Amino acid sequence: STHFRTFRSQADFSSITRASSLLDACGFYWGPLTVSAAHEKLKSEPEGTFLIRDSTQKNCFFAISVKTATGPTSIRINFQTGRFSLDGSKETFDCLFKLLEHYLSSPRKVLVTPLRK
Amino acid sequence: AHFEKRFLKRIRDLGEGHFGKVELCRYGDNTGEQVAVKSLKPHIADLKKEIEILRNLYHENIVKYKGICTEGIKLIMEFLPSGSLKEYLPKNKNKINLKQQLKYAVQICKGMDYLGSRQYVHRDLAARNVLVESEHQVKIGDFGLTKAIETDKEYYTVKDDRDSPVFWYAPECLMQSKFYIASDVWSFGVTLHELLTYCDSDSSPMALFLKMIGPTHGQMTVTRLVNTLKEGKRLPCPPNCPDEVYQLMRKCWEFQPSNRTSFQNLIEGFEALL
Ligand SMILES: Nc1ncnc2c1ncn2[C@@H]1O[C@H](COP(=O)(O)OP(=O)(O)O)[C@@H](O)[C@H]1O
Ligand SMILES: [Mg+2]
Ligand SMILES: [Mg+2]
């Protein structure tokens, strides 16, 4: 818990502060929510209710927590050179909210309704 | 300068860092002296770079280079019995007064100033890496993250993709991975804070900054740490620390690298108080 990775560039730092600024504007960003704390808030919601929070891993910024058929789960949001991508996908986005607006129209229909504060 | 692995003693362990392990050895007559051996502890290419840096340095306040143990490669160096300030200060709180602390601060600055004269930025100047030789002498070690600034450049941008002690790092290091000589000056002020708090765990730089930040985890901790520094928030004045010493400590924490003091002005500042 002592060491982290510094930002690789000013452009990378501008990408995360731009995303953090947009996340504070929306109502479904909960910040430093742990995996167990986020899943407790989602286990009683209708299927497909998603949530944005800070990841707990040292090398990851944000994560999504959604409720599927088997219950609440979490997916990593990979960030690399100003690009955002899901842990199990090959679609990169220059904005975090363009990443979310895409999977709201994906044929998988995983995300549908956000959990607001 | 080539030590054989067949004559190493492997007595006990000395300390564990974020990158490697250090053990105490000697090299049946036991005529060999005590030596500190640093192993990889999983990388291999980084330890060879650290050895080439230590073999290039030769200062009174820097750990002396000894040899190399081939196989993998093990780094051999002189053994300082008192360990690091992280372990020496909590055990000698009633022994080390303020004058002895300022004497340690002068030795660290003279060692860092010599390190900067060779275009080297330490990038890990902390109390855990300041080894104690005696009550009156300390040396600087752990050059695993040390980088060389080009002679025509003012800083060196890191593309290592490796972990960093972010709670000792200046804003330009956190935001851009740029490392000036002034970046080590920032780390010195944090290390000076450790020296005056006798390396107390409850008053550690991480614990105090996490208090200012509030609830945080993951890599977003780095983002919130930068925002805290952008709000002008710094480590408080340690207890029983005079104002003249804390002012020199604040000169190391200017947000702009160009506004920070230099190591030679720090030496003149502490020597004026002795
Ligand atoms: N020559 C030495 N004498 C005494 N203690 C040492 C010596 N070298 C290392 N240590 C101890 O080992 C610990 C970590 O060593 P270091 O090489 O800084 O770790 P790393 O480089 O892997 O982060 C330090 O806290 C220090 O007390
Ligand atoms: Mg160390
Ligand atoms: Mg190290």
Residue numbers in the entry:
A (entry chain B): 52 to 168
B (entry chain A): 868 to 894, 898 to 912, 918 to 946, 951 to 1153
How do the authors describe this structure?
Prolonged signalling, particularly by inflammatory cytokines, is detrimental to both the cell and the organism, and is therefore tightly regulated, in particular, by the SOCS (Suppressors of Cytokine Signalling) family of proteins. We have determined its mode-of-action by solving two X-ray crystal structures of SOCS1 bound to its physiological targets (both the ElonginB/C adapter complex and also the JAK1 kinase domain). SOCS1 is shown to be a direct inhibitor of the catalytic activity of JAK1, JAK2 and TYK2 but not JAK3. Our structure reveals that SOCS1 inhibits these three JAK family members by blocking the substrate binding groove on JAK, acting as a pseudosubstrate.
